[PDB]
């Protein structure tokens with residue numbers, strides 16, 4: 177490029193910067209092409225072009241001006257890239273602001289979508305504010321290849337689409353530009369199918385939706401509604417390995433954490449709306465907005481000390497009682513809690529407080545509701561036509577045709593969408609087995625095998641691998657968490673190693689072992705010592721997340737206290753011992769709202785949590801317990817640097833079944849960060865109990881779950897204990913401990929202590 181062209185850009189004299197900025201073809205070779213990407217990045221000193229799907233990165237060079245950059249790249253196609261931009265000591269990664277010169281679908285967009293590889297399809301499908309032929313308006317586009325006709329109906333034409341019939345492009349996608357309407361427009365698509373039947377559909381790629389049970393889509397100017405402040409969070413994430421950090425997740429169902437009064441409006445970020453009543457049977461209650469949740473949930477979490485919030489599915493869903501797991505509006509955060517920019521504000525405020533956001537994401541199925549994706553164009557479009565692979569009959573839902581390119585693309589791009597537009601830090605996928613098996617919840621003679629005779633759902637395995645390949649290329653540093661309940665192998669291993677590409681898997685066997693164990697009367701736990709220790713046998717086959725989830729405190733299973741035997745003191749003590757063990761056992765941690773304050777009743781998705789319990793000392797003490805435990809977890813490297821290496825854990829003794837006592841070490845990089853953990857899972861105290869330790873010296877009692885401030889009896893070692901030169905458990909030194917009842921101790925060598 178010339179200096180004159182540069183200067184035109186720098187001084188805002190150029191007639192159309194898209195002519196120069198963005199990605200432009202320079203030449204075509206025999207087997208490749210030469211491209212330039214240009215960027216004007218005021219205040220940046222350096223920039224790179226990332227091609228995350230090829231795992232490449234090329235520096236950009238300043239050209240004529242220190243803030244004007246170019247990068248020449250040879251490759252057959254340059255569809256997928258990001259700009260990494262350094263301003264002083266800080267780096268951000270963004271999509272190219274000049275990527276798309278027009279709001280309409282190009283030939284190239286259509287080709288990539290036809291092939292299943294348009295990672296940014298949601299920039300063109302759906303509804304977008306823009307300009308065509310000189311006039312501002314909204315561009316609508318929808319995939320419906322077998323429809324006979326499609327029209328845009330909405331507020332702007334009183335729901336009569338005769339003058340807003342769409343144009344079909346390439347036998348596949350319908351479009352229309354509507355001048356002089358903007359964000360806030362309410363609409364649907366009116367489709368006529370091959371039989372002549374006329375019906376109404378919400379926008380599959382819609383960005384916002386009326387409040388259930390209404391279903392019209394609403395136009396959002398998604399790139400001009402919110403100003404983020406989380407660049408430093410996003411930089412640290414991208415440059416860190418979350419597997420080597422503390423990860424303690426507070427799992428939350430937004431609709432049922434806390435309710436407000438329906439006698440007032442729902443406040444929004446700089447605005448308000450009518451209240452959304454929780455149900456017809458509880459009409460005095462409304463949901464809190466994303467905005468109110470930012471102001472209330474986030475400081476609550478921060479003070480408790482969790483590193484992450486995990487949300488039950490926030491994608492738009494018609495029935496509260498599905499908990500969000502039957503989604504019909506995959507590209508919009510539920511309108512129960514306000515607008516897209518209110519959820520953006522929630523995430524930005526998490527990041528300001530140093531808290532990450534994990535979304536439960538639901539690619540496995542979708543419900544039959546007629547506004548949604550089902551039978552979209554008068555054919556089996558999103559779902560597979562064969563009910564043996566396209567329906568989950570026991571659930572009454574439909575299963576995506578993962579082999580069909582445009583369906584694969586809908587979902588792959590949807591996962592990316594949440595990380596792009598809403599800056600989330602992770603996803604969690606429930607019931608991964610439901611996708612992986614062609615015989616899932618199907619009787620003999622009612623499913624068919626794959627092309628090799630097996631039960632593996634090949635197309636679904638390929639989709640999962642593609643999702644996780646792409647996610648980590650575009651957004652390194654994120655969490656991709658699976659729950660897979662059939663011992664499918666290598667769930668949390670890289671795709672190139674034959675895995676499914678997740679980086680963490682819920683340890684469901686661990687969860688069952690613990691909750692079954694703790695539910696046993698303590699005298700009988702001697703017959704089930706193996707529940708305590710067994711999960712360490714397979715532990716290194718995956719990267720495990722230790723999750724005690726929402727699913728465990730519903731349907732007659734009781735809340736945590738209710739699972740435990742004994743009198744009220746012992747029930748609390750059991751909860752503290754279980755969770756101290758959980759936080760000291762190798763693996764990352766997840767627990768569900770209400771567990772941290774000892775709610776007695778099961779989680780009820782139709783009400784809110786029993787916050788009044790925190791008026792009382794025992795609940796307050798348990799909450800302080802969790803606060804201190806989260807703090808300890810973040811403060812002790814041996815609890816998080818080596819979760820997934822043999823070095824990070826070793827049993828000291830796990831053979832005393834007759835007293836339900838086990839002990840173990842956790843280690844990190846520094847040998848002085850080693851921790852000694854001792855568990856007593858009966859109510860019998862022990863005044864002298866010997867445990868082998870690896871070094872001489874004074875072992876401080878760093879944590880004790882029987883402390884009086886946690887509701888315990890305050891038994892313990894009065895600060896700590898000198899090791900004896902007295903070999904035990906095959907170690908040269910040993911501690912003569914007092915073990916409190918139904919309690920866990922954590923001890924740590926203070927090598928500077930005065931003898």
Ligand SMILES: [Mg+2]
Pocket residue numbers: 335336337
């Ligand atoms: Mg009509």
Ligand SMILES: [Mg+2]
Pocket residue numbers: 606607
């Ligand atoms: Mg399940």
Ligand SMILES: [Mg+2]
Pocket residue numbers: 704
């Ligand atoms: Mg057993």
Ligand SMILES: [Mg+2]
Pocket residue numbers: 783784785786
């Ligand atoms: Mg309530």
